[PDB]
Scaffold this motif. Structure first.
Motif, mmCIF file in Angstrom:
data_model
loop_
_atom_site.group_PDB
_atom_site.id
_atom_site.type_symbol
_atom_site.label_atom_id
_atom_site.label_comp_id
_atom_site.label_asym_id
_atom_site.label_seq_id
_atom_site.Cartn_x
_atom_site.Cartn_y
_atom_site.Cartn_z
ATOM 1 N N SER A 140 0.821 -1.214 0.000
ATOM 2 C CA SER A 140 0.000 0.000 0.000
ATOM 3 C C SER A 140 0.849 1.255 0.000
ATOM 4 N N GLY A 141 0.248 2.326 -0.503
ATOM 5 C CA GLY A 141 0.878 3.631 -0.515
ATOM 6 C C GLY A 141 0.469 4.434 -1.721
ATOM 7 N N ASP A 142 1.211 5.494 -2.009
ATOM 8 C CA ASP A 142 0.839 6.411 -3.089
ATOM 9 C C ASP A 142 1.808 6.390 -4.271
ATOM 10 N N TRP A 143 2.348 5.220 -4.574
ATOM 11 C CA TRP A 143 2.871 4.955 -5.915
ATOM 12 C C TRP A 143 4.108 5.812 -6.198
ATOM 13 N N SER A 144 4.195 6.414 -7.375
ATOM 14 C CA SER A 144 5.383 7.181 -7.743
ATOM 15 C C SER A 144 5.639 8.311 -6.746
ATOM 16 N N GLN A 145 4.580 8.884 -6.184
ATOM 17 C CA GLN A 145 4.706 9.971 -5.202
ATOM 18 C C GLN A 145 5.441 9.485 -3.962
ATOM 19 N N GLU A 146 5.158 8.257 -3.550
ATOM 20 C CA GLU A 146 5.861 7.623 -2.427
ATOM 21 C C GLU A 146 7.308 7.236 -2.780
ATOM 22 N N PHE A 147 7.548 6.819 -4.025
ATOM 23 C CA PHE A 147 8.911 6.551 -4.490
ATOM 24 C C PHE A 147 9.769 7.806 -4.346
ATOM 25 N N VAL A 148 9.226 8.963 -4.724
ATOM 26 C CA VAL A 148 9.939 10.223 -4.549
ATOM 27 C C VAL A 148 10.124 10.518 -3.056
ATOM 28 N N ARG A 149 9.038 10.368 -2.288
ATOM 29 C CA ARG A 149 9.064 10.726 -0.855
ATOM 30 C C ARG A 149 10.101 9.922 -0.105
ATOM 31 N N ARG A 150 10.076 8.610 -0.263
ATOM 32 C CA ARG A 150 10.973 7.773 0.538
ATOM 33 C C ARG A 150 12.434 7.901 0.131
ATOM 34 N N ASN A 151 12.681 8.442 -1.053
ATOM 35 C CA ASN A 151 14.029 8.644 -1.558
ATOM 36 C C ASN A 151 14.401 10.115 -1.595
ATOM 37 N N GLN A 152 13.875 10.878 -0.632
ATOM 38 C CA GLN A 152 14.175 12.276 -0.469
ATOM 39 C C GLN A 152 15.653 12.584 -0.578
ATOM 40 N N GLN A 153 16.472 11.754 0.050
ATOM 41 C CA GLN A 153 17.908 12.031 0.074
ATOM 42 C C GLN A 153 18.588 12.057 -1.252
ATOM 43 N N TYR A 154 17.983 11.468 -2.255
ATOM 44 C CA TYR A 154 18.531 11.362 -3.600
ATOM 45 C C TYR A 154 18.004 12.420 -4.542
ATOM 46 N N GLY A 155 16.880 13.058 -4.243
ATOM 47 C CA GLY A 155 16.368 14.077 -5.149
ATOM 48 C C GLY A 155 15.860 13.482 -6.478
ATOM 49 N N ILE A 156 14.784 12.725 -6.399
ATOM 50 C CA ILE A 156 14.222 12.022 -7.539
ATOM 51 C C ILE A 156 13.463 13.015 -8.430
ATOM 52 N N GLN A 157 13.874 13.090 -9.697
ATOM 53 C CA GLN A 157 13.276 13.951 -10.695
ATOM 54 C C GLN A 157 12.485 13.076 -11.655
ATOM 55 N N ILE A 158 11.176 12.990 -11.460
ATOM 56 C CA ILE A 158 10.305 12.125 -12.270
ATOM 57 C C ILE A 158 10.230 12.645 -13.692
ATOM 58 N N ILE A 159 10.370 11.745 -14.654
ATOM 59 C CA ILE A 159 10.225 12.070 -16.074
ATOM 60 C C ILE A 159 8.937 11.473 -16.641
ATOM 61 N N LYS A 160 8.694 10.192 -16.379
ATOM 62 C CA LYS A 160 7.585 9.452 -16.992
ATOM 63 C C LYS A 160 7.075 8.439 -15.978
ATOM 64 N N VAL A 161 5.743 8.257 -15.920
ATOM 65 C CA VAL A 161 5.120 7.205 -15.142
ATOM 66 C C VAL A 161 4.057 6.519 -15.981
ATOM 67 N N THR A 162 4.135 5.210 -16.076
ATOM 68 C CA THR A 162 3.150 4.403 -16.799
ATOM 69 C C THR A 162 2.512 3.426 -15.835
ATOM 70 N N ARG A 163 1.190 3.476 -15.773
ATOM 71 C CA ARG A 163 0.423 2.558 -14.921
ATOM 72 C C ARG A 163 0.146 1.268 -15.649
ATOM 73 N N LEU A 164 0.529 0.146 -15.046
ATOM 74 C CA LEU A 164 0.255 -1.198 -15.580
ATOM 75 C C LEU A 164 -0.744 -1.899 -14.669
ATOM 76 N N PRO A 165 -1.620 -2.721 -15.243
ATOM 77 C CA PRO A 165 -1.819 -2.972 -16.686
ATOM 78 C C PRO A 165 -2.278 -1.713 -17.397
ATOM 79 N N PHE A 166 -1.714 -1.470 -18.574
ATOM 80 C CA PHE A 166 -1.959 -0.228 -19.273
ATOM 81 C C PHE A 166 -3.287 -0.243 -20.045
ATOM 82 N N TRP A 167 -3.523 -1.316 -20.750
ATOM 83 C CA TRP A 167 -4.687 -1.438 -21.596
ATOM 84 C C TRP A 167 -5.761 -2.132 -20.820
ATOM 85 N N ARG A 168 -6.994 -1.791 -21.105
ATOM 86 C CA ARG A 168 -8.084 -2.575 -20.547
ATOM 87 C C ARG A 168 -9.337 -2.566 -21.417
#
Length: 93
Positions: free
Chosen positions: A65-93
């Motif tokens: 559980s959590g908030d996805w790419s937003q949490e990836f950035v949050r938990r890696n604060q020390q690294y300064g994550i600069q998001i470029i692209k996010v794709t949600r899978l499964p993509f097609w439905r």
């Protein structure tokens, strides 16, 4: 429910390197990682807290559980994550 949802995230880092956040190099386009909802690289066949059934469902403890790419950035604060692209899978439905 099923723990089949994941995200493909491409990003750059101000500090550290792709491996520090369990991502893979994707030079010259930064790093890439596949995460579960907890914003951590996916570590099993699916995104359960524990093992899942034949379909990726009814996982032990449900899904991570959590908030996805937003949490990836949050938990890696020390690294300064600069998001470029996010794709949600499964993509097609």
């Amino acid at each position: 429910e099923c723990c089949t949802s994941r995200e493909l995230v491409e990003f750059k880092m101000d500090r550290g390197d792709c491996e520090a956040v369990r991502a893979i190099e994707n030079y010259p386009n930064g790093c890439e990682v596949t995460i579960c909802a907890d914003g951590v690289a996916q570590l099993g066949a699916y995104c359960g807290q524990g093992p899942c059934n034949i379909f990726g469902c009814n996982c032990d403890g449900g899904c991570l559980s959590g908030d996805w790419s937003q949490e990836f950035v949050r938990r890696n604060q020390q690294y300064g994550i600069q998001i470029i692209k996010v794709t949600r899978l499964p993509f097609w439905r």
